[PDB]
Amino acid sequence: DICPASEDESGQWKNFRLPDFVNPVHYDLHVKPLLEEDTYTGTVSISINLSAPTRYLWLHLRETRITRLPELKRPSGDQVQVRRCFEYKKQEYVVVEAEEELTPSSGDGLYLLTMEFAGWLNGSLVGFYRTTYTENGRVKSIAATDHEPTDARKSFPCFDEPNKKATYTISITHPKEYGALSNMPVAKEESVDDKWTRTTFEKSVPMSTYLVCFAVHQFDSVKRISNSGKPLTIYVQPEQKHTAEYAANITKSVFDYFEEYFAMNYSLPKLDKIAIPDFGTGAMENWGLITYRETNLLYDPKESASSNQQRVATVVAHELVHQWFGNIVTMDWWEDLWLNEGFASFFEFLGVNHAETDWQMRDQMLLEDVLPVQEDDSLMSSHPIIVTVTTPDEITSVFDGISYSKGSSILRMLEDWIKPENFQKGCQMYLEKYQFKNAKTSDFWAALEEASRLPVKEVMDTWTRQMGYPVLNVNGVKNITQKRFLLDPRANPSQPPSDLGYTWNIPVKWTEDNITSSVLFNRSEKEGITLNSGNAFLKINPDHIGFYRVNYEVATWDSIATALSLNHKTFSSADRASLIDDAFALARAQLLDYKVALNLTKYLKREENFLPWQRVISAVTYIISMFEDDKELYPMIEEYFQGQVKPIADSLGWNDAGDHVTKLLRSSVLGFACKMGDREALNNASSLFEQWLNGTVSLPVNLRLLVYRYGMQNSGNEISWNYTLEQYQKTSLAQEKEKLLYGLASVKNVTLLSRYLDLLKDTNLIKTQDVFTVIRYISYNSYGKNMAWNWIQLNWDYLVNRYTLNNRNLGRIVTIAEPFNTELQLWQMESFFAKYPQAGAGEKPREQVLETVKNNIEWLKQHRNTIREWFFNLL
Ligand SMILES: *[C@@H]1O[C@H](CO)[C@@H](O[C@@H]2O[C@H](CO)[C@@H](O[C@@H]3O[C@H](CO)[C@@H](O)[C@H](O)[C@H]3NC(C)=O)[C@H](O)[C@H]2NC(C)=O)[C@H](O)[C@H]1NC(C)=O
Ligand SMILES: *[C@@H]1O[C@H](CO)[C@@H](O[C@@H]2O[C@H](CO)[C@@H](O[C@@H]3O[C@H](CO)[C@@H](O)[C@H](O)[C@H]3NC(C)=O)[C@H](O)[C@H]2NC(C)=O)[C@H](O)[C@H]1NC(C)=O
Ligand SMILES: *[C@@H]1O[C@H](CO)[C@@H](O[C@@H]2O[C@H](CO)[C@@H](O[C@@H]3O[C@H](CO)[C@@H](O)[C@H](O)[C@H]3NC(C)=O)[C@H](O)[C@H]2NC(C)=O)[C@H](O)[C@H]1NC(C)=O
Ligand SMILES: *[C@@H]1O[C@H](CO)[C@@H](O[C@@H]2O[C@H](CO)[C@@H](O)[C@H](O)[C@H]2NC(C)=O)[C@H](O)[C@H]1NC(C)=O
Ligand SMILES: *[C@@H]1O[C@H](CO)[C@@H](O[C@@H]2O[C@H](CO)[C@@H](O)[C@H](O)[C@H]2NC(C)=O)[C@H](O)[C@H]1NC(C)=O
Ligand SMILES: *[C@@H]1O[C@H](CO)[C@@H](O[C@@H]2O[C@H](CO)[C@@H](O)[C@H](O)[C@H]2NC(C)=O)[C@H](O)[C@H]1NC(C)=O
Ligand SMILES: *[C@@H]1O[C@H](CO)[C@@H](O)[C@H](O)[C@H]1NC(C)=O
Ligand SMILES: *[C@@H]1O[C@H](CO)[C@@H](O)[C@H](O)[C@H]1NC(C)=O
Ligand SMILES: N[C@@H](CCC(=O)O)C(=O)O
Ligand SMILES: [Zn+2]
Q1: How far is ligand 1, taken at its centre, from the CA of residue 243, in Å?
Q2: Which ranges in the chain are annotated with CATH 1.10.390.10?
Q3: What is the required cofactor set for this protein?
Q4: Count of CB atoms situated within 10 Å of the CB of 295
Q5: Which of 151, 277, 341, 639 is the most exposed place for a label (fewest CB within 10 A)?
Q6: What is the CATH number assigned to the segment(s) 553-875?
Q7: How far is the CA of 651 from the centre of ligand 3 (A)?
Q8: Pocket of ligand 3 contains residue 873 by CB under 6 Å
Q9: 228 pocket-lining for ligand 7 (C-beta < 6 Å)
Q10: How far is the CA of 123 from the centre of ligand 4 (A)?
Q11: Does 17 belong to an annotated binding site?
């Protein structure tokens, strides 16, 4: 109550954005958690470079309270008279008004502001918090922090903006049974009591608030040493110690690869990794202390899948990229978030490709980022890569497909156009230029433009300052022209307004008879260009390397189908995936007749590669989804696609054999077989499930998920549900737990799914981090599509209270409505949204799922007969 809230607008603290004339240099931060009380206290002393006459000093603070009237120091050292302090809620500030204004730190002397604060460790996964786990029957505690993007201000009062880089010396007073970790190595350990220890860490390099991290733990460790000679260690619960090995391997390999690739030293003396037993995102790149959700870090070769292996490798690689792109060089403002996330999403594939050679990681970029985000970015409710954000809710919202995947995709296009070698050098120069400072997007262009003298800014701005992407329309084999590709044909292609008018500078690549050529397709070529060997067939956009779609003439498309039916290997696996992906997306947008798209699938009985099958399954999943309740169309589509996978499903079999990609292929191919109703695949699932219920037999790691899902679906009951629920509690491996949750969500029983939904309110059973995962799994259930949707509506106030409107996963949960395809269902959504109109971080997802559902309704109206004719005539 000493620093109370007031609604006083008459000041610069009414501004969302922090003032230009106040900068932090150094933070002296001390915190003392009372672990078994779920509280902490702390003091922060901040050195402040003032630049203008101000009677007010303000900075960010949320939920956590100031307990003592703050103390102000002049550059000379004198005590400053402080009249009041107060909180201004609307922009998450605490403001202190001095008696008088005093002016800039002109000569190495700085102001010093000291504040005492108390906060909570409970009810939350952001800021500074405590969670528990069980070790040899005992409940143990671990405390950690999580800040990105606007949560450092919950932990301690600070200038919570990515460009207010300051240096840190952190100390923690904890009980002696615990160790304390932070960004920097331990400097000194001193006894307060015979019970308490004060751990002081050595001074940091300049860094943003969102990167500040500390933890109090009783974890064991697995150790590695870099080529730099620096200790790289993963902290892990003693019972889980053996599952930390693989992450330790990749950390070494990828750390050593990146340091060399970026031509720059890792800035800190050590690097730590730790998985928090309850953790709100996937992982977080805190300078020197990277925090993980266990599924993304901990891997067991004897129980985890190849899928899991790759996920661990990729997230680790991702988190390591950030130590350069994000940490050393940080975006100036969140609008340029892709400078962090896009770069990490691109370089992750390079890291893991170094570590794991036969994973075809470069090709998998198509499956993971490129083709999925081309779906996202064909909606009106997408946004440009450089995004205007004006609230904390808007800031957190842009941690999405666009920042990550399109970021990754347009770098993938850029690298290829500019050539890998020059892209590398260009990244290096940017990295040394803006080291320990902040960069804008223009700065990265200017850096790469110095590596190629190609018109990088001019070309890359078109991809970056407007949403969407083009479809190239082919006239007469050789003439191309560009148009915006939108999934909704009724949508206005000029909206929302763009200076660039939705035309792009398209780096174009094409293959003529195994020889490859390149052109930049200029915006100002309004009537299109012509592509420079007298030719019959011209393969445009090889390996789908550019962020665009190609619509060949119908004749060409027809010839491609026949070419696939005669010898599909004529195309590279990536090229098959891409052609199939484009055709089905073009058909979805009413730019290509569905008969033409479906014809490309006729060859599939002989398809044996991962990439094409993945993009086939993706396209079919949607079509099958739209006809779930059509008793006439569904069996026909099912019957067909069952026959098209049967050969490869049988050939690969129900057993973990072959290399990484083959094993990934088997998972999704057997899964699709099950999905399409194959009696024999379902029986394998039920048979293995029955065996697993017998309590000894350890399932083949790459088949487990399918066995739990389809086994529970086809032969699950209360006895086996209860058992599966027991198993989920008993296993320590998070990757197994998550599979078992999908199993539990698969039962065809309303009563059991109802028990499952009730468990979501029980924190001893379902972790806070997993609630949205479980809701999503249930929504995939034929019964639970409606149950999950109904439950989030009835329990909306409860979820908002538990997570806050600022939590992006809560915001995104409405996307469980994506398969909706009737006017009735759309009315439900709109009714629910009108009832709870304060959407927070859910604002964009709402817009997106509404757009999707409307498209769905239209799609059914446009294509039901055409698709029916195609299947009926064939069968
Ligand atoms: C983390 O990194 C290690 C290397 O940096 C991996 O390598 C393990 O260690 C052994 C030698 O370093 C390897 O040697 C042997 O390989 C041959 C196979 O032809 C066999 O003699 C043995 O299976 C194996 N030696 C053993 C088991 O003592 C192994 O290939 C290898 N594996 C094991 C279990 O030791 C680690 O595998 C790697 N760990 C993880 C989890 O990824
Ligand atoms: C798990 O799935 C396997 C398929 O991937 C099943 O194996 C197949 O079983 C089929 C029937 O038992 C066989 O198909 C045909 O059987 C009839 C019997 O009357 C024969 O005429 C046909 O010649 C034969 N088809 C062919 C193409 O030869 C399969 O041959 C058989 N094997 C394979 C490799 O496909 C498993 O039975 C199933 N397991 C469980 C426990 O359900
Ligand atoms: C691209 O798709 C085209 C449109 O579907 C294909 O052309 C169709 O082939 C069908 C064969 O599956 C034909 O259906 C047969 O003909 C009549 C339809 O009126 C029926 O009586 C027959 O029962 C049926 N055949 C069987 C075995 O049941 C269609 O006539 C035909 N449709 C049109 C509009 O021409 C192309 O073949 C396909 N191109 C490829 C694969 O390259
Ligand atoms: C952590 O727990 C404390 C108390 O255990 C919560 O504070 C209580 O809030 C409820 C209503 O929201 C009141 O009935 C109590 O009087 C409060 N207690 C105290 C001591 O203030 C606190 O809200 C929890 N923190 C979070 C983030 O949920
Ligand atoms: C779904 O599961 C419920 C819960 O187990 C089943 O209800 C049980 O049915 C058995 C046999 O008919 C009874 O002995 C139990 O008393 C019932 N339990 C409860 C809690 O009601 C139900 O039959 C299943 N529904 C299906 C398979 O459609
Ligand atoms: C499966 O698990 C449930 C939960 O433990 C069992 O317990 C019943 O749960 C319902 C609520 O869903 C309670 O109202 C009943 O009183 C519980 N029964 C008790 C305490 O005996 C359920 O019995 C289990 N079923 C099987 C077949 O194991
Ligand atoms: C960069 O790495 C090199 C080689 O390991 C080393 O000699 C140099 O001191 C490093 N630069 C630093 C720590 O600033
Ligand atoms: C393609 O463009 C060229 C050059 O503008 C022109 O000669 C030709 O007629 C165009 N049309 C077709 C179908 O090739
Ligand atoms: N950069 C993190 C997400 C951080 C967050 O959203 O809290 C990741 O994608 O791994
Ligand atoms: Zn990231």
Answers
A1: 14
A2: 220-468
A3: Zn(2+)
A4: 26
A5: 639
A6: 1.25.50.20
A7: 30
A8: yes
A9: yes
A10: 9
A11: no
User: Looking at ligand 4, which atom is closest to the CA of residue 63?
Assistant: 27
What experimental approach yielded this model? X-ray
Q: Which helix or strand (DSSP H or E) is residue 87 part of?
A: strand 82-88
CATH class of the domain whose range is 1-219: mainly beta
Q: Is 319 a catalytic residue?
A: yes
> Which part of the chain has CATH 2.60.40.1910?
469-552
CATH superfamily of 220-468: Neutral Protease Domain 2 (1.10.390.10)
679: its two tokens? 């009696």
Domain boundaries for CATH 2.60.40.1730 within the chain: 1-219
183 vs 215: CA distance, rounded Å:
10
What are the start and end residues of each CATH 1.25.50.20 domain in the chain?
553-875
**Which amino acid does the sequence have at 80?**
V
CATH for the stretch 469-552? 2.60.40.1910
Contact status, residue 43 vs residue 117, Cβ threshold 8 Å: yes
Q: 828 is written with which tokens?
A: 């439900």
Q: Is 874 in the pocket of ligand 3 (CB under 6 A)?
A: yes
Take atom 27 of ligand 3 and give the residue whose Cα is closest. Answer: 874
**Ligand lying nearest the CA atom of residue 267:** 7
Q: Using alpha carbons only, give the angle 447, 344, 443 rounded to the nearest 5 degrees.
A: 20
> Which residues, listed in sequence order, are joined to residue 331 by a DSSP beta bridge?
439
Resolution in A: 2.4
Work out the number of other CB atoms within 10 angstroms of the CB of residue 273: 25
Retrieve residue 302's tokens: 């004897």
User: Would you say 148 is a known binding-site residue?
Assistant: yes
Report the candidate in 415, 381, 379, 383 with the shortest Cα–Cα distance to residue 399.
Answer: 383
Q: Which atom of ligand 8 is nearest to the CA of 479?
A: 1
Q: Is residue 546 within 8 Å of 556, Cβ to Cβ?
A: no
Q: Compute the distance between CA of residue 632 and CA of residue 783 in angstroms, rounded to an integer.
A: 21
Instruction: Give the active site residue among 161, 319, 335, 375.
Output: 319
Is 284 known as a binding-site position? yes
